[PDB]
Amino acid sequence: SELYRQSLEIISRYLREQATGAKDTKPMGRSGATSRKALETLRRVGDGVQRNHETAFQGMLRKLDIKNEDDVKSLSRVMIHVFSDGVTNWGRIVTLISFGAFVAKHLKTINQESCIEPLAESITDVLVRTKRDWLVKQRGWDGFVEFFHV
Ligand SMILES: Cc1ccnc(-n2ccnc2)c1-c1cccc2c(CCCOc3cccc4ccccc34)c(C(=O)O)n(CC(=O)N3CCNCC3)c12
Ligand SMILES: [Zn+2]
Ligand SMILES: [Zn+2]
Secondary structure (H helix, E strand, C coil), X not given: CHHHHHHHHHHHHHHHHHHHCCCCCCCCCCXXXXXXXXXXXXXXXXXXXXXXXXXXXXXXXXXXXXCCHHHXXXXXXXXXXXXXXXXXXXXXXHHHHHHHHHHHHHHHHCCCHHHHHHHHHHHHHHHHXXXXXXXHHCCHHHHHHHXXXX
């Protein structure tokens, strides 16, 4: 669907920019203004989450103990568990994606950057496939952008 593809583009762009520090100039495409606004929202709100929850993020990264691609496969089990537990909302979705960026930065640091794209795919899979009903009900990325109104 466009929801999956839109979500993948936003999340992948955010993780790549976080990991590399570089901004992608290629147009978003279909939901341009909204996708661009969603990415900007992740930049601002996600920075806040990474900073304000740095202690937990650093501790979690240590727990995952990522050395290679095999460890990146193993964290998908943890991701789907922790995220699926309890009630979802945009705050938890930002935590999911912001932590993804935090992990992606680590992957850059250890020179295993090729895992960033599959990680973004994994995050998108868990978000869109498992919470489709909630996302649709809450107006998808339009809803996300309006909720935070950065
Ligand atoms: C597990 C944990 C324990 C204590 N404090 C935490 N933490 C994170 C920020 N502040 C605390 C967290 C915590 C750490 C990292 C992410 C989250 C999330 C988002 C969904 C899970 O995301 C991932 C898990 C594993 C690997 C991943 C790799 C890439 C991207 C995402 C990954 C949550 C959540 O869904 O709420 N939590 C739990 C959390 O925030 N809690 C705090 C209060 N008590 C336990 C629940 C994560
Ligand atoms: Zn926290
Ligand atoms: Zn806490």
